[PDB]
């Protein structure tokens, strides 16, 4: 959408979760900078009126902030000239049974926005846990249209944010832990008409492939693989949901995202590469047809769900300025691909303790597996890094184009894993592994790191008490801001990693910070309200260390630092 692209370039706005179509999470605002951030104070605050995990962050467009909640996914609008009043509210009525089929807390990664055009007035888009995509009038909150994407009776929900491209809004999927076969869907913004729908497994017509799919890298695989890399009909329940983030290149007219893990977690029940789960896709915008598809983790054994964000940039590769995507996967590798051809540029370890894979062979594109850290029936596999939580999860990260550095919140969590046999029944969980998780070999649970994604050179690295889950915001003031699970927002100097400022929020953070200018002043805003996968223990009062899909034991100390909450904090000088 060229008007949405243009609004994204205006520092008064934050028009999508990812900030802009490249997912830079980078602001040119410098009012707040490394030399005065120690003076940042809370300006004003809002309550969301809910508990549970608060993922994503607010949108700001044309002087209005938009807020969203975890289930039941209430939305409200606030005029930045009258911060105490809610301009409008939208309160979904959803079946409470939706909560029982969410694997990982009833999180929602937030709203999307499109400006007014031929399709009608400006709209806010919401994905509901119960599987509906809703279009609201951005100025009034009136419901314009609503469609069914996902059915909770099959264990299929929505948690990832909608994504607007031209006249379409894209809606993902969720429920691979209940055997949902992933799919992404484009709806027309005017009337909610389904334009196209691309599945992650199965026959080529379902995958929606360009006739020249992987023409540039035929060694990745081309046709027939969504059937031939599974035994029989096991693809029909085979995972590959896409509950993460998108990017878009308007010049190529290509949309990028990752498909998630194959189901079940029990690898022995699903022999084969299990394509095209765990895949980096480049899809034509109008048709949805994939131009490239790179499977990062063939035959996943670890739930490295391949949904993490895609950060676009233009950097020199062997001296030639090249359009790129960069993608810190769950599997602990940072992928950088040519975003036109899909060619692999690099795949480096985000922390050197990654052990499921020895290295990626860049020429073949294959990860060279270490069988010592495989999983398999009738075996308790020990000391696998990363754990299923990944060395990176759902947080959107940030890129400073002057430094050519990505700044990432990183997890340092490893695991033991033993699968088990179990039947598939639609609507029930379909996991089939028992896990124990714990800190990686360096002994803490999180890090923040700065890196060059072409060379792999780590600029700086610093430890954090807990996994850094919510992502980052970087600015031209030489700062990276992020929130922590234990309930801080913090700012570090992006040259050195030095900590410049910290503030104690009410609850842990699982979303990202934003910044915007309003009436000549810079603000930083963030949600506070712990939850998501790390918070399942505290949110659901769980005690068995293998409960919450194995996260309970690793995060057992988090409840000593934070309770649940739900608030928006806005800071300024």
């Amino acid at each position: 959408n060229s008007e949405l692209d243009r609004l994204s370039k205006d520092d008064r706005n934050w028009v999508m979760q990812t900030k802009d179509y490249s997912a830079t999470h980078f602001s040119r605002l410098t009012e707040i900078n490394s030399h005065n951030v120690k003076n940042l104070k809370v300006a004003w605050t809002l309550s969301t009126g809910t508990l549970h995990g608060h993922e994503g962050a607010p949108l700001v467009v044309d002087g209005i902030m938009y807020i969203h909640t975890p289930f039941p996914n209430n939305v409200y609008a606030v005029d930045l000239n009258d911060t105490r009043k809610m301009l409008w509210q939208y309160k979904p009525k959803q079946n409470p049974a939706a909560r029982a089929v969410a694997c990982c807390d009833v999180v929602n990664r937030g709203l999307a926005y499109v400006p007014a055009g031929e399709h009608g007035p400006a709209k806010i888009f919401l994905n509901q846990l119960d599987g509906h995509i809703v279009a609201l009038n951005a100025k009034t909150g009136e419901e314009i249209w609503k469609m069914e994407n996902s059915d909770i009776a099959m264990g299929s929900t929505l948690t990832g944010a909608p994504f607007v491209v031209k006249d379409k809004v894209l809606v993902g999927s969720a429920g691979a832990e209940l055997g949902v076969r992933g799919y992404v869907t484009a709806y027309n913004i005017k009337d909610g008409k389904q334009e196209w729908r691309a599945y992650a497994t199965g026959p080529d017509e379902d995958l929606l492939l360009d006739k020249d799919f992987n023409k540039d890298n035929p060694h990745y695989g081309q046709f027939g693989l969504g059937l031939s890399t599974w035994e029989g009909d096991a693809w029909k329940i085979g995972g590959g949901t896409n509950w993460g983030w998108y990017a878009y290149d308007p010049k190529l007219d290509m949309i990028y995202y990752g498909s998630g893990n194959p189901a079940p977690w029990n690898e022995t029940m699903r022999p084969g590469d299990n394509k095209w789960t765990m895949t980096i896709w480049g899809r034509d915008a109008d048709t949805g047809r994939a131009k490239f598809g790179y499977q990062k983790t063939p035959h996943d054994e670890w739930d490295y769900a391949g949904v993490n964000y895609m950060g676009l940039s233009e950097q020199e590769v062997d001296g030639k300025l090249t359009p790129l995507l960069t993608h810190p996967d769950r599997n602990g590798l940072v992928y950088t691909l040519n975003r036109e051809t899909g060619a692999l540029v690099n795949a480096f370890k985000i922390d050197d303790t990654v052990n499921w894979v020895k290295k990626v062979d860049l020429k073949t594109g294959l990860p060279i597996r270490d069988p010592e850290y495989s999983t398999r029936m009738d075996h308790n596999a020990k000391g696998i890094c990363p754990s299923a939580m990944g060395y990176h999860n759902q947080g959107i990260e940030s890129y400073d184009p002057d430094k050519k550095l990505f700044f990432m919140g990183v997890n340092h969590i490893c695991m033991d894993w033993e699968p088990f046999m179990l039947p598939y029944r639609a609507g029930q969980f379909f996991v089939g592994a028992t896990l124990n998780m714990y800190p990686g070999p360096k002994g803490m649970l999180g890090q923040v790191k700065a890196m060059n994604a072409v060379t792999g050179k780590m600029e700086w690295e610093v430890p954090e008490k807990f996994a850094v889950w919510g992502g980052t915001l970087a600015t031209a003031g030489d700062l990276v801001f992020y929130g922590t699970l234990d309930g801080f927002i913090k700012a570090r100097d992006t040259r050195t990693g030095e900590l410049k400022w910290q503030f104690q929020l009410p609850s842990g953070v699982i979303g990202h910070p934003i910044t915007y200018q309003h009436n000549g002043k810079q603000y930083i805003a963030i949600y506070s309200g712990v939850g998501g996968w790390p918070g399942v223990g505290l949110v659901f009062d769980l005690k068995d260390p293998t409960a919450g899909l194995g996260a309970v034991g690793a995060f057992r100390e988090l409840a000593h630092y934070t309770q649940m909450g739900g608030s928006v904090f806005v800071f300024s000088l």
Partner: protein, 71 residues
Amino acid sequence: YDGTHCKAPGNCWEPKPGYPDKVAGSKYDPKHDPNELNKQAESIKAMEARNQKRVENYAKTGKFVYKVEDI
């Protein structure tokens, strides 16, 4: 199984030592019920058909109506 021995481009899977090429008939046979397997796709077809009713009513009347029994 180190992931580098490929039967075909995009297809590198091997069984691990001592495990079967095919699971059907093995001790690891998932024995999925084909009727259970098909339920998701049936549910999608039903959602798609309702959505298409809502779209058609919008194009006919100019007013959006969610509940398909009210159209």
